[PDB]
Ligand binder design. Structure first.
Ligand code: CL
Lengths: 248, 49
């Protein structure tokens, strides 16, 4: 059940609201303690609504990217255990752009996939910026994990927008000379936290047409990291980066 | 009638309360995670020589 069955946004119904709090009690040792103090408070800090960034016509793209990422950060990573926005990955772009607009209006915490949708939505207005999803599948201890960021390319350099608990699994300045180096910076991050990288999925550049009905192509390239050579791995990334440089 | 005006004000106030609780919960969950990871790190600190 989506958090927003009651279509639209907040406020949600009681059934949904209680379900979120029952879940909090199962994942936190004190469980009900934390909920008692929040649900029982008669005043709670006011959380400003983050304002979508505005730019001068002359503001360079690397500045726009910093501010798009600063905006995505302000919503905060979602530690609550409850996913607020349902995101169907096989869904026409324009329908994902409607969702992004609502995220900006409801202003609730987000995870990696929301950040990718938001990233596309907030950079559709930058025609010299190429955007494309990068997905990682890793292994850590008896489990497989999935993470996704919005790879971007500006003036022949690669970077990324995203959200993670770790500073080195999200934002990257558009400074990497090659796609292999961008991806390698994420491999280093996963090395640091002991994850074994299993797959990288790279999608096609995403149309800037906010009204496009094509769905995002999340796995134009799938790289099986164990079965590919380190050298064939790098040649596969460069093939995908070329394939993208052609469809312009 | 002007029930829609009071019902919209009601909706906005409850929206604001629900969002404030969500963010108060987000902060608490962040502190728990930090606390639990810190205990885990303290536990395995090497004794050295
Ligand atoms: Cl930043």
């Amino acid at each position: 059940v989506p958090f927003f069955v009651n279509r639209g946004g907040l406020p949600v119904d009681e059934a949904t609201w209680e379900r979120m709090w029952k879940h909090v009690a199962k994942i936190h040792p004190d469980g009900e303690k934390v909920a008692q103090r929040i649900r029982g408070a008669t005043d709670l800090p006011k959380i400003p609504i983050p304002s979508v960034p505005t730019f001068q016509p002359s503001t360079p793209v690397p500045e726009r990217l910093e501010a798009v990422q600063r905006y995505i950060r302000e919503l905060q990573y979602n530690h609550t255990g409850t996913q607020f926005f349902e995101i169907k990955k096989s869904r026409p772009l324009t329908g994902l752009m409607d969702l992004a607009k609502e995220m900006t209006k409801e202003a609730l915490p987000i995870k990696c996939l929301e950040a990718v949708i938001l990233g596309i939505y907030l950079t559709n207005s930058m025609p010299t910026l190429e955007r494309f999803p990068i997905s990682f599948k890793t292994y850590f201890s008896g489990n497989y994990f999935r993470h996704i960021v919005l790879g971007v390319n500006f003036a022949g350099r690669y970077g990324a927008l995203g959200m993670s608990r770790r500073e080195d699994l999200m934002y990257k300045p558009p400074a990497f000379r090659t796609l292999s180096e961008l991806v390698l910076d994420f491999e280093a991050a996963y090395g640091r936290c002991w994850h074994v990288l299993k797959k990288v999925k790279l999608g096609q550049s995403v149309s800037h047409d906010p009204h496009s009905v094509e769905q995002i192509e999340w796995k134009h390239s799938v790289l099986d990291v164990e079965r590919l050579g380190r050298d064939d791995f790098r040649k596969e990334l460069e093939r995908h980066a070329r394939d993208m440089r052609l469809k312009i | 009638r002007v029930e829609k005006a009071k019902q919209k004000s009601a909706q906005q106030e409850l929206k604001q309360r629900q969002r404030a609780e969500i963010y108060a919960l987000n902060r608490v969950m962040t502190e728990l995670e930090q606390q639990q990871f810190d205990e885990f790190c303290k536990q395995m600190q090497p004794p050295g020589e």
